[PDB]
Protein backbone atom coordinates (compact mmCIF):
# COMPACT_ATOMS: atom_id res chain seq x y z
CA UNK A 1 0.00 0.00 0.00
CA UNK A 2 2.19 2.83 1.33
CA UNK A 3 5.22 4.12 -0.54
CA UNK A 4 8.37 6.09 0.21
CA UNK A 5 7.80 9.74 -0.64
CA UNK A 6 4.07 9.71 0.21
CA UNK A 7 2.45 12.56 2.11
CA UNK A 8 0.92 11.15 5.30
CA UNK A 9 -0.49 11.96 8.72
CA UNK A 10 0.63 10.11 11.85
CA UNK A 11 -2.39 9.45 14.13
CA UNK A 12 -4.42 11.56 11.76
CA UNK A 13 -2.93 14.86 12.90
CA UNK A 14 0.85 14.94 12.55
CA UNK A 15 1.77 15.68 8.92
CA UNK A 16 4.94 14.34 7.29
CA UNK A 17 6.37 12.22 4.47
CA UNK A 18 7.32 8.59 4.35
CA UNK A 19 11.13 8.34 4.02
CA UNK A 20 11.59 4.68 4.95
CA UNK A 21 9.49 1.53 4.90
CA UNK A 22 10.76 -1.81 6.07
CA UNK A 23 12.15 -3.98 8.81
CA UNK A 24 14.72 -2.47 11.20
CA UNK A 25 17.26 -3.42 13.88
CA UNK A 26 15.37 -1.91 16.83
CA UNK A 27 12.11 -3.96 16.91
CA UNK A 28 10.37 -6.69 14.89
CA UNK A 29 7.90 -6.27 12.04
CA UNK A 30 7.28 -3.42 9.61
CA UNK A 31 8.13 0.22 10.30
CA UNK A 32 7.52 3.50 8.50
CA UNK A 33 10.18 6.18 9.01
CA UNK A 34 8.53 9.57 8.66
CA UNK A 35 9.98 13.03 8.37
CA UNK A 36 7.52 15.32 10.22
CA UNK A 37 6.63 18.91 9.22
CA UNK A 38 7.33 19.98 12.81
CA UNK A 39 10.26 18.95 15.05
CA UNK A 40 8.09 16.94 17.41
CA UNK A 41 9.57 13.49 16.71
CA UNK A 42 12.18 11.29 18.38
CA UNK A 43 15.16 11.12 16.06
CA UNK A 44 17.11 12.28 12.98
CA UNK A 45 16.34 9.18 10.91
CA UNK A 46 18.76 7.04 12.92
CA UNK A 47 18.00 4.81 15.97
CA UNK A 48 20.77 3.41 18.20
CA UNK A 49 23.42 4.47 15.69
CA UNK A 50 21.71 2.75 12.79
CA UNK A 51 20.83 5.01 9.86
CA UNK A 52 17.51 4.37 8.08
CA UNK A 53 17.03 7.81 6.55
CA UNK A 54 18.33 11.34 7.09
CA UNK A 55 16.51 14.40 8.45
CA UNK A 56 17.03 17.28 10.90
CA UNK A 57 17.02 16.49 14.66
CA UNK A 58 13.61 15.50 16.09
CA UNK A 59 11.89 15.60 12.70
CA UNK A 60 12.04 11.83 12.35
CA UNK A 61 9.84 9.16 13.92
CA UNK A 62 9.30 5.44 13.28
CA UNK A 63 5.76 4.15 13.57
CA UNK A 64 3.66 1.21 12.44
CA UNK A 65 2.16 1.62 8.99
CA UNK A 66 -1.28 1.00 10.50
CA UNK A 67 -0.98 4.35 12.29
CA UNK A 68 -0.72 6.27 9.02
CA UNK A 69 -3.27 7.93 6.78
CA UNK A 70 -2.42 8.80 3.17
Amino acid sequence: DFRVGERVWVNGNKPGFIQFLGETQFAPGQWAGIVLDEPIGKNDGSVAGVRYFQCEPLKGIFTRPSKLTR
Binding site: V10, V47, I61
Partner: peptide
Protein backbone atom coordinates in the same frame (compact mmCIF):
# COMPACT_ATOMS: atom_id res chain seq x y z
CA UNK B 1 3.74 13.10 24.26
CA UNK B 2 1.55 9.98 24.39
CA UNK B 3 0.97 9.71 20.64
CA UNK B 4 4.65 8.70 20.38
CA UNK B 5 4.19 5.65 22.58
CA UNK B 6 5.21 2.54 20.67
CA UNK B 7 7.23 4.67 18.24
CA UNK B 8 10.98 5.04 17.81
Amino acid sequence: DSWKDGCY
